[PDB]
Amino acid sequence: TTFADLGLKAPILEALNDLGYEKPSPIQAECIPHLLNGRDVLGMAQTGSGKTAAFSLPLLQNLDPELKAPQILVLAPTRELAVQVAEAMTDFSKHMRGVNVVALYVQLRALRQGPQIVVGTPGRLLDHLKRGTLDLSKLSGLVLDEADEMLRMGFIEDVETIMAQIPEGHQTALFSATMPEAIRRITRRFMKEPQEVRI
Ligand SMILES: Nc1ncnc2c1ncn2[C@@H]1O[C@H](COP(=O)(O)O)[C@@H](O)[C@H]1O
Numbered sequence: 001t002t003f004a005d006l007g008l009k010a011p012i013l014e015a016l017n018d019l020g021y022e023k024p025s026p027i028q029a030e031c032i033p034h035l036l037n038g039r040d041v042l043g044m045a046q047t048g049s050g051k052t053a054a055f056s057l058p059l060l061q062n063l064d065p066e067l068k069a070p071q072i073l074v075l076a077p078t079r080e081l082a083v084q085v086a087e088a089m090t091d092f093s094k095h096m097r098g099v100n101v102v103a104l105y106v107q108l109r110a111l112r113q114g115p116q117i118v119v120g121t122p123g124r125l126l127d128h129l130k131r132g133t134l135d136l137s138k139l140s141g142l143v144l145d146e147a148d149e150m151l152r153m154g155f156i157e158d159v160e161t162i163m164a165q166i167p168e169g170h171q172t173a174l175f176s177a178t179m180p181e182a183i184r185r186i187t188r189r190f191m192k193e194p195q196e197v198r199i
Pocket of ligand 1: 020021022025046047048051052053
């Protein structure tokens with residue numbers, strides 16, 4: 001199975017070639033078609049599996065590149081992962097003109113540029129959400145990257161608050177290496193008939 005076999009088109013395929021990705025990882029082969037098809041996905045995988053591209057590639061391909069406003073919001077537990085994911089998203093979109101990524105963990109002028117992808121930690125995202133500097137009215141895709149870690153670090157209240165402010169019509173991808181009950185409950189509250197992927 002190739003990346004083109006998963007339904008990815010030339011701009012993303014070219015970025016993958018620039019990055020030296022030769023073939024999809026298992027989590028990518030399983031998750032990418034579901035997300036391209038507009039499903040919610042519960043992905044059980046950890047760093048090293050390729051989970052970042054698994055959620056990033058399909059949601060990038062699915063956005064409106066001419067809409068200069070946040071369409072993909074990615075929640076991460078740490079400044080380090082937020083920055084890493086934003087860098088990856090920037091690399092995957094290298095051949096998508098006018099598509100821009102912001103990491104929030106300087107922040108004001110980031111959001112004023114109308115980035116289509118915003119990656120951040122829950123506390124800092126929730127600050128800009130309350131301030132109105134973060135517009136989620138046009139959001140199409142929500143990712144929780146390491147939901148179990150956000151729970152464990154004490155951030156789940158803020159995660160829930162963010163998730164309850166998102167407009168009805170959106171895709172959700174939730175990635176978690178483990179499955180605490182509180183994450184099961186988040187899946188039931190906030191996701192629509194999710195495809196569960198554990199290999
Ligand atoms: N399909 C792939 N082929 C080669 N390297 C990859 C692939 N997908 C992800 N990677 C790399 O694998 C590492 C783990 O990614 P992640 O699991 O998303 O943190 C990162 O260094 C990625 O650049």
